[PDB]
Enzyme design. Structure first.
Site, PDB file in Angstrom:
ATOM      1  N   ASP A 520     -58.199 -22.194  -9.380  1.00 15.40           N
ATOM      2  CA  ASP A 520     -56.839 -22.248 -10.027  1.00 15.40           C
ATOM      3  C   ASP A 520     -55.894 -21.282  -9.343  1.00 15.40           C
ATOM      4  OD1 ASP A 520     -57.927 -23.795 -12.386  1.00 15.40           O
ATOM      5  OD2 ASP A 520     -58.662 -21.905 -13.206  1.00 15.40           O
ATOM      6  N   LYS A 614     -45.490 -12.944 -21.270  1.00 19.78           N
ATOM      7  CA  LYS A 614     -46.090 -14.125 -20.802  1.00 19.78           C
ATOM      8  C   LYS A 614     -45.185 -15.311 -20.889  1.00 19.78           C
ATOM      9  CE  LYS A 614     -50.569 -15.971 -21.212  1.00 19.78           C
ATOM     10  NZ  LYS A 614     -50.901 -17.377 -20.692  1.00 19.78           N
ATOM     11  N   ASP A 786     -52.543 -27.953 -10.143  1.00 17.93           N
ATOM     12  CA  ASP A 786     -52.696 -26.767  -9.374  1.00 17.93           C
ATOM     13  C   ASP A 786     -54.132 -26.273  -9.548  1.00 17.93           C
ATOM     14  OD1 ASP A 786     -52.314 -26.499 -12.014  1.00 17.93           O
ATOM     15  OD2 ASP A 786     -50.498 -25.127 -11.908  1.00 17.93           O
TER      16      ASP A 786
END
Ligand SMILES: Nc1ncnc2c1ncn2[C@@H]1O[C@H](COP(=O)(O)CP(=O)(O)OP(=O)(O)O)[C@@H](O)[C@H]1O
Ligand SMILES: [Mg+2]
Ligand SMILES: [Mg+2]
Length: 857
Positions: A520, A614, A786
């Site tokens: 990842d 975040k 991704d």
DNA sequence: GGAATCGATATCGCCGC
RNA sequence: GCGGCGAU
DNA sequence: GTCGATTCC
């Protein structure tokens, strides 16, 4: 009574007699006889799909909110609104007291009434028994009444006040509550806002029947949808005039619904590698179903055709290569779920481990949703776990892959690799390799990822794995007797592995291991931008540059913010009481405007960490800027704070969240300047190209509205063309639907930034599929936009192939500029100046990528 | 010009009223 | 269409 | 409910 499609129609895809000897030959009679009977099921599972949904559409009268019935109401509403418009000139051009319905029907927009009738009509007509024009007329009026009454709110009184309304309105579902809402709004609107009466209390049930009857009349007048015939004429307690749907129009529906139910296939996976993609269509599945797969998932048929003759083999192979990957059900993992899900809504949810109103009703709202999901979430579980059970004894199964208009590969079927934990954990690859001392160094790494350790150096992650070797083993020995897997940030996968890690121990490195280790990226988003601009600050952040310590974009912008807090905590502005008068009440108030100096105090008082940053930053790639974080800050940490016990310090929620925003927004627009710049530049580009440049001296169209188009590094071309209809037809509590098109510059300028990166990561992954296929013998991949994975063995390679595929693409081109050359000669003369320059580059050396342990891919 | 309005998180999918 | 879920 | 940026007066 829908035309059962399940006849000669699905029969079409013949699983025993079709030009399928192609598959037979290639894979055999059984699998080719299978692949077709499956595909066939898909459709059969698609029809059924449609019926049950259509069942409750009639069974609630919502048969108008069904694409099966929407084509009629498109030619049926023009006939009906015209007749009521002539009828309003028929009594207006005639003296004498105006009919009973005409006094009322002069309040609700005629178009509205027009429809209001159609719908509730068909709704009662699809009821069990009661169809009498008595109850019927009663219904129609009931409703029209509501719309002249509460539609006045949306028209004059809440001209803008409606903003605060709409919101809680749509959120309100089902005719009832929506009314519950509008009456309480009305009682407070006249209690402050505009004053008057309530001339709808005089609307006797009689007035109601009157309305509901003159309408229906207009209805059988303008159209023959319904024939008004007598039911048993010559009886005192039976002679009732009732309505019936014109058998002709009933066939229109039953038929439209019929053909509809045949284009909603339930895509399963394949029994035999998919049918390579030759182009545009015909790809993936083999049969010739009445629902072919497009190379690209697009909106408008024309938009798909723009591809037909385009060349791009890099791309066609990627799909095809990636689509060839063979997987198999993780038979071990499954009999674990096969147990715990039949003893728990969520196998991994709860395991035995060691401001008054606006708040009490705040958590109350919670407790509602939190149970909505817990039941929707299981609805999806019950599915997977079933699929999974179908194909557990299959030797190997395959997934077809399309793309979205911007690139991104997706599998086709419902049950696919790109699932969720549980999902991904039942899915392992069919052909294995034996692992090896380097192949197992990666089993283990994965195992570290699946348990949550992934922001600490790979040895560490290995330290971890080894410290708990006994545990793991435990789990794999007996999974049901041990819940340590379960508690792991990705249980079902992390337990995927434990059965592998104990295969190693029992067979030593000669272990054939098909399990998908996946690499990842950090934040694909910022990465690409930071690369396509050589931004070393930024890349550092997503780990474009190699380091010893895993870099964490959030943690660092966290940082940059704590640094501002303490800087205001000492200097900065002081409080301030400013007077705020209400827009509706005109009442005077006192509000002290917390100052930077204190706001911070609080912030500091609370305790800013990665977790307050975040979401904002991780969405920063999709556009959110300063404005959108507020909402996030506020609900992602400030609310749950107060509503948790802490939060005291949060005296002015909105003000505390208005501020933290800017902080965050300043702290990222310096850590990923790249992303900032690239996005805005792009955003300009699209605006211009979206514009409808004219001369406001001729108000003449100099250069219509241009869509946006570019071509990814691997040959893919994307076409950003967002169209907005010029229609309109808002209704209040019933529906409010359909009534040409043009480019919606907002959507256009919005969706560029994301979309672009999003087509780019696209290229990149399609390339690594290829690259690492050709260059290294890797033939088995796990693709998640991704996220690239492969078997333990080819693993070593992938890891490098990416960091490779990457630096290749950014070195060889400058999509940003390339992108310029694309529109450049499409900017009208006049705007050649509002187009800022491509932001300078940086000192990042892409080649570093090649040595960044942590920027996996 | 200046006062009046929309808008603010991206793409895919499933389920549901 | 709104709602929820899940994927990046 | 801030910032602004695009529309119509
Ligand atoms: N505001 C938002 N809107 C929609 N999707 C969002 C979102 N914020 C996050 N997501 C999604 O939620 C997911 C968050 O998963 P996490 O496991 O919390 C993130 P991560 O990138 O692994 O960093 P982490 O280890 O710090 O948690 C991401 O895959 C992302 O696609
Ligand atoms: Mg994580
Ligand atoms: Mg994401």
């Amino acid at each position: 009574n829908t035309i059962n499609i399940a006849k000669n129609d699905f029969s079409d895809i013949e699983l025993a007699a079709i030009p399928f000897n192609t598959l037979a030959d290639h894979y055999g009679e059984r699998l080719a006889r299978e692949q077709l009977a499956l595909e066939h099921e898909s459709y059969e599972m698609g029809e059924a799909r449609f019926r049950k949904m259509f069942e409750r559409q009639l069974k609630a009268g919502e048969v108008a909110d069904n694409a099966a019935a929407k084509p009629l109401i498109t030619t049926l509403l023009p006939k009906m609104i015209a007749r009521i418009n002539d009828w309003f000139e028929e009594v207006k051009a005639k003296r004498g007291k105006r009919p009973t319905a005409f006094q009322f029907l002069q309040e609700i927009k005629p178009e509205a009434v027009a429809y209001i009738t159609i719908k509730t009509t068909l709704a009662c007509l699809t009821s069990a028994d009661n169809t009498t024009v008595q109850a019927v007329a009663s219904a129609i009026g009931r409703a029209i009444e509501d719309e002249a009454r509460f539609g006045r709110i949306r028209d004059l009184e809440a001209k803008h006040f409606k903003k605060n309304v709409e919101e809680q309105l749509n959120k309100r579902v089902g005719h009832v509550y929506k009314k519950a809402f509008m009456q309480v709004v009305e009682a407070d609107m006249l209690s402050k806002g505009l004053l008057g009466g309530e001339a709808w209390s005089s609307w006797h049930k009689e007035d109601s029947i009157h309305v509901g009857v003159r309408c229906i009349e207009m209805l059988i007048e303008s159209t023959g949808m319904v024939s008004l015939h007598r039911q048993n004429a010559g009886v005192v307690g039976q002679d009732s005039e009732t309505i019936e749907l014109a058998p002709e129009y009933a066939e229109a529906i039953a038929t439209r619904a019929g053909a509809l139910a045949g284009i909603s296939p339930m895509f399963q996976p394949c029994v035999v590698p998919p049918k390579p993609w030759t182009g545009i269509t015909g790809g993936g599945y083999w049969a010739n179903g009445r629902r072919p797969l497009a190379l690209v998932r697009t909106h408008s048929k024309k938009a798909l055709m723009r591809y037909e003759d385009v060349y791009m083999p890099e791309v066609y192979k990627a799909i095809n290569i990636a689509q060839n990957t063979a997987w198999k059900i993780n038979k071990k993992v499954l009999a674990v779920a096969n147990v715990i899900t039949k003893w728990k809504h969520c196998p991994v949810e709860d395991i035995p481990a060691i401001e008054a109103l606006t708040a009490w009703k705040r958590a109350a709202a919670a407790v509602y949703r939190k149970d909505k999901a817990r039941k929707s979430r299981r609805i999806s579980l019950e599915f997977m776990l079933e699929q999974a059970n179908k194909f557990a004894n299959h030797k190997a199964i395959w997934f077809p892959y399309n793309m979205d208009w911007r690139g991104r590969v997706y599998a086709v079927s419902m049950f696919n690799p790109q699932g969720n934990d549980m999902t991904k954990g039942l899915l392992t690859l069919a052909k294995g390799k034996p692992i090896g001392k380097e192949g197992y160094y990666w089993l283990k790494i994965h195992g570290a990822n699946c348990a949550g350790v992934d922001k600490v150096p790979f040895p560490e992650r290995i330290k971890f794995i080894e410290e708990n070797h006994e545990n793991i083993m435990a789990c794999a020995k007996s999974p049901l007797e041990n819940t340590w897997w379960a508690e792991q940030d990705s249980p079902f996968c992390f337990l995927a592995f434990c059965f592998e890690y104990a295969g190693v121990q029992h067979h030593g490195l000669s272990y054939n291991c098909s399990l998908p280790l996946a690499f990842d990226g950090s934040c694909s988003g910022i990465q690409h931008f930071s690369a396509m601009l050589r931004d070393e600050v930024g890349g550092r952040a997503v780990n474009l540059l190699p380091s010893e310590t895993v870099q964490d974009i959030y943690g660092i912008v966290a940082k940059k913010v704590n640094e501002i807090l303490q800087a205001d905590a000492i200097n900065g502005t002081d409080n301030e009481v400013v007077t705020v008068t209400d827009e509706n009440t005109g009442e005077i108030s006192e509000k002290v405007k917390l100052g930077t100096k204190a706001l911070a105090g609080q912030w500091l008082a609370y305790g800013v960490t990665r977790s307050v940053t975040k979401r904002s930053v991780m969405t920063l790639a999709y556009g959110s800027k300063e404005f959108g974080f507020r909402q996030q800050v506020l609900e992602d940490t400030i609310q749950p704070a107060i509503d948790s016990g802490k939060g005291l310090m949060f005296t002015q929620p909105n003000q505390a969240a208005g501020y933290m925003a800017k902080l965050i927004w300043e702290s990222v627009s310096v850590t990923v300047v790249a992303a900032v710049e690239a996005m805005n530049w792009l955003k300009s580009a699209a605006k211009l190209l979206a514009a409808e440049v004219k001369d406001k001296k001729t108000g003449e169209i100099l250069r219509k509205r241009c869509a946006v188009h570019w071509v990814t590094p691997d040959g893919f071309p994307v076409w950003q063309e967002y169209k907005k209809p010029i229609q309109t037809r808002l209704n209040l509590m019933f529906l409010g639907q359909f009534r040409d098109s043009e480019i919606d510059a907002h959507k256009q300028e919005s969706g560029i930034a994301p979309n672009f990166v999003h087509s780019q990561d696209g290229s990149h992954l399609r390339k690594t599929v290829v690259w690492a296929h050709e260059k290294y013998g890797i033939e088995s991949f796990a693709l998640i936009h991704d996220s690239f994975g492969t078997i333990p063995a080819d693993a070593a390679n992938l890891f490098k192939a990416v960091r490779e595929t990457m630096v290749d693409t950014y070195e060889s081109c400058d999509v940003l500029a390339d992108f310029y050359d694309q529109f450049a000669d499409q900017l009208h003369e006049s705007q050649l100046d509002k187009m800022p320059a491509l932001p300078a580059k940086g000192n990042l050396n892409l080649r570093d990528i090649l040595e960044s342990d942590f920027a996996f891919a």
